[PDB]
Every structure is written in C-alpha cells, then in structure tokens.
Amino acid sequence: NCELLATCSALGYLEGDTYHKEPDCLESVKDLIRYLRHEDETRDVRQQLGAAQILQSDLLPILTQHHQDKPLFDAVIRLMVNLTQPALLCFGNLPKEPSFRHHFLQVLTYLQAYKEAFASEKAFGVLSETLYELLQLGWEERQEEDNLLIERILLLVRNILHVPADLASAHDQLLWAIHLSGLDDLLLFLASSSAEEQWSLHVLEIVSLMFRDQNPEQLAGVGRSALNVRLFLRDFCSEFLENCYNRLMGSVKDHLLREKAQQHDETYYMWALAFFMAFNRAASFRPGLVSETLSVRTFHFIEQNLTNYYEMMLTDRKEAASWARRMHLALKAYQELLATVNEMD
C-alpha cells in the first residue's frame, strides 16, 4: 500500500508523447503482480491500481512503446491479464452487502475504463504483431514460454471484449481496432487450423464476444453498431462460416467432452451454435458450412446439456439463477436446431 505506491512511481513517466522507463521497471511490474496475488477479499490492490490508472498511465505506454524489451513486455501482459479479469471472477459471487457491493462496482468501473483505453489500433497492433510472430514458429518448434505468451495475449483480448459481463461504442471501437490491426485475420487463422486446436476454446470465446451486440438475421442483410462495423462483422462471419466454423466447433466440443474436470464454460458453444446457424440460414448459405452442428449427435448433445442444466436448477438451489441462465442458452441452441431442420422439408 505504501509499498504499492512506491512501486508504481518506480515504473516510469511520460515526457510529452514519449514514455521513459526506469531501470527497475521489469522489477516493479513483477512486484505489482505479487501484490495482486496477496490481496484481501476487498480486492484492495486492483482497486488501488485502478484508482491510480496504472494500466493507462504506465502499462499501455510500456506495451506500445517498449515492446522490444521481451521480458518486460511479457511481464506487462501478465499484469494486464490479471487486472482485466472479470469482476465476477474476482469476488466470486455478487455482493449483497452495501460494502462488498461498493467494491465489486468499483472493480467494474475500472474494467470499463480499461476497455475504453484499449480502443486503440496501436495497442492491438502490438498484440497482433507479437501474435503473428509467435505463430510463424512451428507448433513443435516453439517453447512453453511461447505458448504461454500466446495464451495470455488471447486471455487479454478475451477479457477486454468481455467487459462488462457474460453472455456499445466502446465495444465497437475495439472491434474496429481488431479489424485494422489484422488480429481478425489471426483469429480466423487460429479457428481454421488443425494444428492450433489447443486454442479453440479461447478463440470461440473471443469470436462470440465480438458478435455479442448483434442480430444474425440483420447482419446477413435481410433485415446499434455503425454501418462500417456491421459490414466488417458480416464479412468476418461469412469467412468464419466458409472456412472455420465446422473445425472450431468440432474442436471445442472435443475439449468439452474430454475435459469435464476443468469445468469449462460451454455456454460459448451454445451461444455460437444459435448465432452462426441462424446467420447461415438467413444468408442462404449451403448447409454443409454448419454440418458439424447439424446432426443427430448435436441434437443428443444439446439435449444432454439441457437435461443437466434443468436438473441442476432444481437441485443446486444456491446457484439456481445461474443454472436457469445456462438452461436458457441451451434451449435457444435447441430452438435453432429445430428451426433449421423444420425448414429442410
């Protein structure tokens, strides 16, 4: 706290449009990570750093201007991933007391501010360049530090798109920065590549969050975001269906079935099935582009999930509202299957 404020002033400063580090910068960044790992139940550390606007005043300048210092750039990414964590995941559940509730809402206020700071083509430019380079390396020729940095970049993009909650202009600005930086092309590459199946859950979360404000029939152009953002999303969705959906949805489902222990969030799969099958159908694309989720096996899988959610809503009563939300996403996916099959007669 006094330690915390001394560490923050030992990062650097901006002389005009230029950021000057201090020689103990990498050290200070890592100290801030240690503080965040020892914070109380108030999440005081991330609240203090949020109040101080360290992410904006220091970390983003370091990221954009000093990205050739490899250990420091990696340290800053780690810190930003932790600082951009969804507020639900920081406090666990929603505070009912007027105390923790003021905290939760302060954490969320800082998340919303980080989301607007990231509205910048140079931030995403640096992330996309770095990701591009990391992926040029063959899959079995890059080190665990390389895969670990891929993972953190994807988690950071995920977290920034997630703000403020689970499944207007700020998100739109992020989408445009994703488009202008080329990160859109890296996401499509990752989705369509058998060799990058380890990243498929991360990529599906990012793609689903990119489309969160959108209506699939409207986007398909047979009847909110600015027109040039909607056109970019239409183009992205078209390419995604043409080249990526079957592969990505097949790999996600594989992870979901093989890694039950990890309690992956399978709501992104349910959300994506309903959105992208609705778009494919509205656009009159060929059925083959959604064949992976248009099958008896998919009916069975959605039915299994809907049964499980419904049973949990009735037995895990302390979380009944969360299970009801999951049940609603599964049901919407089932309705889209039924609507698609019913138009095949």
Numbering used by the authors: 7 to 173, 183 to 238, 333 to 454
Can I see the authors' text?
Human Timeless is a large, multi-domain protein of 1208 amino acids.
In a systematic effort to identify regions of the protein that could be amenable to crystallization, we produced a construct of Timeless spanning residues 1–463, that was highly overexpressed and soluble in recombinant form. Inspection of the 2.2 Å structure revealed that a large segment of the protein construct, spanning residues 239–330, was not visible in the electron density map, presumably because of conformational disorder. Removal of residues 239–330 did not cause structural alterations in either the TimN crystal structure, or the solution shape of the Timeless–Tipin complex; small-angle X-ray scattering analysis showed a small but significant decrease in hydrodynamic radius for the complex missing Timeless residues 239–330, indicating that these amino acids are disordered in solution. Although it is not possible to assign TimN to one of the well-known classes of helical-repeat proteins such as the HEAT or ARM repeat families, TimN does contain six two-helix hairpins, with the N-terminal four hairpins containing an additional helix in the intervening segment between the first and the second helix of the hairpin. It is likely therefore that the observed dimerization of recombinant TimN is an artifact of construct design. The peculiar shape of the TimN structure suggests that its concave surface might act as a site of protein–protein interactions.
